[PDB]
């Protein structure tokens, strides 16, 4: 038993990380087969970051301007191109550690593991959610761009995120692995703001089920509610609407615990209106929304 923010094992991704240096700017790249993927602002200068013309900056570069180092072995760039907001640096060595992989774009509300890297060297692993406003609340410093977010199913790494930048509020923005930003952000050092966030309701319920599975039951009650009356309370506390499809996804958890989804909703309604009254759930005094129904099943066994 026990429930923790849990990341996927990172070994398969560690062997893909490299350092990309252009001029005085260094960041990380993702080495799959004979291609290195990295954020395009590696080619930027400190001054050319308010409104860069990446198409111009890239035509003024050549293969020998890009220094790619896998550990201490230098990889020779034999080609370069731009795909939206990331670069594809052809190299003459296919990565022998290339895993079975997919490039997938995830949805707000879904989670992934982040392998934070610096100078091509992994530093740590942690679990993130894609917020409804397409930001992520990560832990990233200068030089972390190029770090990737991922999930692992069977033997396949599904890459879903490459880190690019930090917004003034401290949250982080990035692209999918095809180079298209999550959310209305651009890789320029301009004044940008994410839209107002909301709390992922289906994840909160899933976390409450994880709590029941682990012996926390004080928040249960004998009451029930309708999906309509629940959604009225959700709108008020800045919670996302709950759909019939969310109730179905929560089925398995509802079945294992014997607590009907709409009965669990009556508990959530009650926690929103009255608070926790000094108690905790799975070691938190706040309602946690960065666990998907899938994450709970992955960790909590029958």
């Amino acid at each position: 038993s026990g429930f923790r923010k849990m990341a996927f094992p990172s070994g398969k991704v560690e062997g893909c990380m490299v350092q990309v240096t252009c001029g005085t700017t260094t960041l990380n790249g993702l080495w799959l087969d004979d291609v290195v993927y990295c954020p395009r602002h590696v080619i930027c200068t400190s001054e050319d970051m308010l409104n860069p013309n990446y198409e111009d900056l890239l035509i003024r570069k050549s293969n020998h301007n890009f220094l790619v180092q896998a550990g201490n072995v230098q990889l020779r760039v034999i080609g370069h191109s731009m795909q939206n907001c990331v670069l594809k640096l052809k190299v003459d060595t296919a990565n022998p550690k290339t895993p079975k992989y997919k490039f997938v774009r995830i949805q707000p509300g879904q989670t992934f593991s982040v392998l934070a890297c610096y100078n091509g060297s992994p530093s740590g692993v942690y679990q993130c959610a894609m917020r409804p406003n397409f930001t992520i609340k990560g832990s990233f410093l200068n030089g972390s761009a190029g770090s990737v977010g991922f999930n692992i199913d069977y033997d396949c790494v599904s890459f879903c995120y490459m880190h690019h930048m930090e917004l003034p509020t401290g949250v982080h923005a990035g692209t999918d692995l095809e180079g298209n930003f999550y959310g209305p952000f651009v890789d320029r050092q301009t004044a940008q703001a994410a839209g107002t966030d909301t709390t992922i309701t289906v994840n909160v319920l899933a976390w409450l089920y994880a709590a029941v599975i682990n012996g926390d039951r004080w928040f249960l009650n004998r009451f029930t509610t309708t999906l309509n009356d629940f959604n009225l309370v959700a709108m008020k506390y800045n919670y996302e609407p709950l759909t019939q499809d969310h109730v179905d996804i929560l089925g398995p958890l509802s079945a294992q615990t014997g607590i009907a989804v709409l009965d669990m909703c009556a508990s959530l309604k009650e926690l929103l209106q009255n608070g926790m009254n000094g108690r905790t759930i799975l070691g938190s005094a706040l309602l946690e929304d960065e666990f998907t129904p899938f994450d709970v099943v992955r960790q909590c066994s029958g």
């Binding site: 990233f140 410093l141 690019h164 930090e166 003034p168 923005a173 320029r188 050092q189």
Partner: peptide
Amino acid sequence: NRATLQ
């Protein structure tokens, strides 16, 4: 303040 390309 502004965004920071990292």
